[PDB]
Structure 1
Amino acid sequence: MFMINILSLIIPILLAVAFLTLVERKVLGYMQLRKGPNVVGPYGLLQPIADALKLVTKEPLRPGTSSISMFIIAPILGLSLALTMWVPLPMPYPLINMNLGVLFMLAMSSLAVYSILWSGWASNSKYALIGALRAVAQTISYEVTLAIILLSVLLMNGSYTLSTLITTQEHIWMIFTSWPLAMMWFISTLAETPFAMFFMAEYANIIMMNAFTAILFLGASHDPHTPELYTINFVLKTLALTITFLWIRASYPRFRYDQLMHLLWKSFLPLTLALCMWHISLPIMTASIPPQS
């Protein structure tokens, strides 16, 4: 029945990808004195169905100067990635308990840059070429802060096994030991994230990033007998983070590129190095090095 478990994950995540959009528009709506989708079905419950089947009935126009092969495989990778990093999440018990789950999460999430890079190239337009160039450099700039934060975070965890994160936190949320890193981590997650697909690809990244941040910094207690306790806690924590993720979507003017690079390489990277230096010696400092096994 293991295959059934995959569909018991991919589809609801796909629906979860579908259904937080109404949350977004109504949160973004009610924020600006507005109402959000509330006329199509009760409180816009059927609004996601109101757009999806319309989109699939819309003809997918293709640019004349577009390489079809790349134009159709770039979304293939984009969706394939966006629904793959959901598999090793230590949600109650992960589908895959890869001993190197954190590395697998990073390598495969850093692969998303290919989709946007190919989309700009395959589209073959002046707008698409720069937009791909801007998006990728913004993205490829920000794994170095991503990797260091996660690396330095995991010194006090014990290994890259994502299931071990629960044991590490247990007593207190792990933010209380690395809250300078949490703001370091959370901000970096904002910027790293056919056309019908591209909704799904980046969007699962939005929730999973917050799901990834949820387990990493704000853990829960996984009772061996009853697993529903971790389920509710995990969902509630990743909902609060995502609401915050859209809380800041309509609360700041968007970053400009020169500051976007300046913010990292001159005010985020050097501080990330110091915290990593702080969190590499502190387990040694207090003889609190964790067990890998």
Structure 2
Amino acid sequence: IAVPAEILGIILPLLLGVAFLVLAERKVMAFVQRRKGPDVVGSFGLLQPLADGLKLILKEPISPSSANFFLFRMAPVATFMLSLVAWAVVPFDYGMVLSDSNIGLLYLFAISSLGVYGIITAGWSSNSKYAFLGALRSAAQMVSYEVSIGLILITVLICVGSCNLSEIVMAQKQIWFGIPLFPVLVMFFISCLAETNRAPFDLPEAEAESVAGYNVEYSSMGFALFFLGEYANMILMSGLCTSLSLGGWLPILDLPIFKRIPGSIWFSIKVILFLFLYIWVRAAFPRYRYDQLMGLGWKVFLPLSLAWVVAVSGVSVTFPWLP
């Protein structure tokens, strides 16, 4: 019926957006670094993702024969499932949701919790022990920063009585929650940066460095699926950031000239600014050591998140400012 059509219309444009997102990351990083990104495969490099995908498809696969063939193959499948089903709930405007779950926030938190298993199984199923150690490190980092992310979600849930993203936005109608909670938004942005192993806290992508990663053993399509899952998670958490601290499909100042824009355009624009911030932070800053980032996650963001939860609860309970 219409549900498979909606699911396909969510999934395929998401893959196109991920491809153009890696292309945009290349272009923005190059323009930052006083150079030009992919410009020779199509006009302005618009066909570069297509060429890359076709090359990856046409590349002949190799079988590691690691005695864990099923677990080796299914881990990128698992993370791809997790990214897609996480994207299954995010709203885009008033009524553009597949599952209008009343517990949408906790659903996304649970899906983020499940995300470590793909990397853990990928590291274990690989023959090399370096990949296993890197997978363990990445899993632990995602664990700590997801604890921080959950505390930030609790702050937002204190601000808004409901638990579904659509009603969250409907409450965001007034002040966007970013004006009241800009430090909370900053902490959530850094936590989601460390959640997807992007920007600083980039352990798996430091392959030229001694940490190596969990994708060393993986073949063409395994690596491609892991990359697609990571970038889909990046877009997902940018959407989470804009739905939580920027009002989602809501204009600025509620002027009637701004209401001519559908609102899905507003959500897309905010997601684009968040992705630009992702690439900006990745290009502009060095990376943390594993111990440094773990101590920072467990000692800097967790106490601050707890303190902000307490402060928001105290502000809301004391005054009649409660929903």
TM beyond 0.5:
yes
- Distance between the aligned counterparts of 1:91 and 1:228, measured in 2? 13
Distance in 1 between the 2:25 and 2:3 partners? 33
Deviating more after overlay: 184-193 vs 168-177? 168-177
Task: Tell me which amino acid in the other structure corresponds to 2:39.
Answer: N
1:87-106 correspondence to structure 2 within 5 Å:
87-92=88-93, 93=95, 94-106=97-109
CA distance in 1, matches of 2:67, 2:192: 31
Show the counterpart of 2:125.
122
Q: 2:250 aligns with which of 209, 213, 221?
A: 221
Distance 1:279 1:269 in 2: 15
Aligned mates of 1:98, 1:65 — CA distance in 2: 41
Partner of 1:178: 181
Q: What is the aligned partner in structure 1 of residue 204 from structure 2?
A: none
Query: Cα distance, 1:54 vs. partner?
Result: 0.5
Shift of 1:64: 3.2
**Which residue does the alignment assign to 2:16?**
15
1:144 matched residue in structure 2 = 147
CA offsets per residue over residues 19-71 of structure 1, 9 Å max, x none?
11111101111111110000111000100111001101112223233511101
Q: Which residue of 2 aligns with 1:261?
A: 294
Q: Structure 1 227/118 Cα, relative in aligned 2: closer, same or farther at 3 Å?
A: farther
Structure 1 residue 18, shift from structure 2 partner: 1.4
Deviation at 1:221, TM superposition (A): 2.9
After superposing on structure 2, the runs of 4+ consecutive aligned residues of structure 1 that deviate more than 4 Å are none
**Rounded Cα–Cα distance in structure 2 between residues aligned with 1:22 and 1:147:** 31
- Residue 286 of structure 1 aligns with which residue? 319
Report matched runs for 1:1-293 at 5 Å: 1-92=2-93, 93=95, 94-193=97-196, 194-219=222-247, 220-221=249-250, 229-290=262-323
Gaps of 5+ in 2: 197-221
Aligned-partner Cα distance in 1 for 2:149–2:110? 11
Per-residue CA deviation, residues 162-189 of structure 1 (Å, 9 max, x unaligned), is: 1111211112221111112111111000
Q: 1:58 to 1:66 in 2, by over 3 A?
A: farther
- In 1, distance between residues paired with 2:60 and 2:307? 52
SS of structure 1 residue aligned to 2:282? coil
Letter in 1 for 2:112: S
The residue type equivalent to 1:282 in the other structure is V
Query: Partners of 1:137 and 1:111 in 2: how far apart?
Result: 13
Q: Alignment length, in residue pairs?
A: 288
- TM superposition shift of 1:199: 1.3
Do the aligned partners of 2:250 and 2:267 also contact (CA within 8 Å) in 1?
no
- Relative distance call for 1:114 and 1:227 in structure 2 (3 A) is farther
Q: Report the aligned-residue RMSD.
A: 1.5
Check conservation: 2:176, 2:245, Cα contact below 8 A.
yes
The separation in 2 between residues aligned to 1:216 and 1:177, in whole angstroms, is 12
Q: Percent identity?
A: 45
